[PDB]
Amino acid sequence: ASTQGISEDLYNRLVEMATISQAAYADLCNIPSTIIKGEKIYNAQTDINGWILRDDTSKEIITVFRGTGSDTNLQLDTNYTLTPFDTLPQCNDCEVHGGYYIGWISVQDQVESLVKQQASQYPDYALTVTGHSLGASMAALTAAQLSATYDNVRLYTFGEPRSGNQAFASYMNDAFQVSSPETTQYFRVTHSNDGIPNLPPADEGYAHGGVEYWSVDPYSAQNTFVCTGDEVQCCEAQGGQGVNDAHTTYFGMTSGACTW
Numbered sequence: 001a002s003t004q005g006i007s008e009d010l011y012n013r014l015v016e017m018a019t020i021s022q023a024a025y026a027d028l029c030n031i032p033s034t035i036i037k038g039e040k041i042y043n044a045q046t047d048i049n050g051w052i053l054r055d056d057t058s059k060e061i062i063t064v065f066r067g068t069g070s071d072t073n074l075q076l077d078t079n080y081t082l083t084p085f086d087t088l089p090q091c092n093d094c095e096v097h098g099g100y101y102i103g104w105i106s107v108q109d110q111v112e113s114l115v116k117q118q119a120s121q122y123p124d125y126a127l128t129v130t131g132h133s134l135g136a137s138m139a140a141l142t143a144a145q146l147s148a149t150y151d152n153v154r155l156y157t158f159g160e161p162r163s164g165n166q167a168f169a170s171y172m173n174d175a176f177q178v179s180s181p182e183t184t185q186y187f188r189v190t191h192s193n194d195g196i197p198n199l200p201p202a203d204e205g206y207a208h209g210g211v212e213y214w215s216v217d218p219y220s221a222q223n224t225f226v227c228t229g230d231e232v233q234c235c236e237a238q239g240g241q242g243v244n245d246a247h248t249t250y251f252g253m254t255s256g257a258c259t260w
């Protein structure tokens with residue numbers, strides 16, 4: 001359930017996608033120059049904002065969701081009602097976040113048309129879904145959906161809320177090889193006493209998935225714990241409340257905007 005320290009390469013990929021998630025709050029700020037910016041993801045009734053990127057130097061298609069940046073996004077945040085994840089039958093007995101399901105159904109067609117449009121050109125490329133805060137959960141619902149059709153799908157999240165019940169957790173765990181940290185393709189990154197991945201309350205049947213990568217201060221790869229199994233530990237053990245400095249800044253990069 002816990003070991004300290006991760007490879008540099010691994011730490012760098014984490015810091016690397018953590019830079020894309022925060023860059024989304026602006027206009028994909030100083031993101032790696034190896035990647036090409038694709039089409040914008042938008043729906044004005046929910047204010048979901050995302051992007052489709054492609055790295056012709058790395059060989060992957062990346063989908064990035066911007067987190068909460070408006071009151072409309074805030075209305076999706078506070079809704080803790082569970083609802084059948086009717087878009088994915090496969091997921092046996094799953095239910096996901098209420099407000100996040102409102103957002104997901106509002107971009108699914110867009111994301112799936114935009115994603116296949118890129119894959120059908122590069123069947124070679126692997127799919128990656130990343131995001132911070134609500135953007136982070138949006139990426140989970142997305143990855144889950146996508147991964148039922150494509151195979152090589154990775155997922156990196158930062159400050160991810162509890163998006164779903166145990167039925168959904170164990171679904172992601174099977175589909176993303178969480179059984180072990182040498183095969184995991186779902187990286188649930190948490191920071192210090194970030195109190196966001198603690199909501200919504202688990203007393204309500206919510207539950208986390210993926211393999212937890214715990215970051216302590218100072219950042220570092222030597223200061224990142226690999227947390228697994230099911231019990232209280234790491235980020236959940238610090239009991240942060242909600243929306244705190246630990247949340248907004250990841251690996252020393254604030255959502256607010258650029259400095260990287």
Ligand SMILES: *[C@@H]1O[C@H](CO)[C@@H](O[C@@H]2O[C@H](CO)[C@@H](O)[C@H](O)[C@H]2NC(C)=O)[C@H](O)[C@H]1NC(C)=O
Nearest residue numbers: 075079080081082083084097098099100101102
């Ligand atoms: C809070 O979230 C729930 C859950 O998603 C919302 O109700 C769902 O609405 C969708 C369509 O928008 C329906 O297809 C689902 O069947 C509903 N789920 C449930 C739990 O019945 C609900 O509208 C949201 N409440 C507010 C005030 O926005």
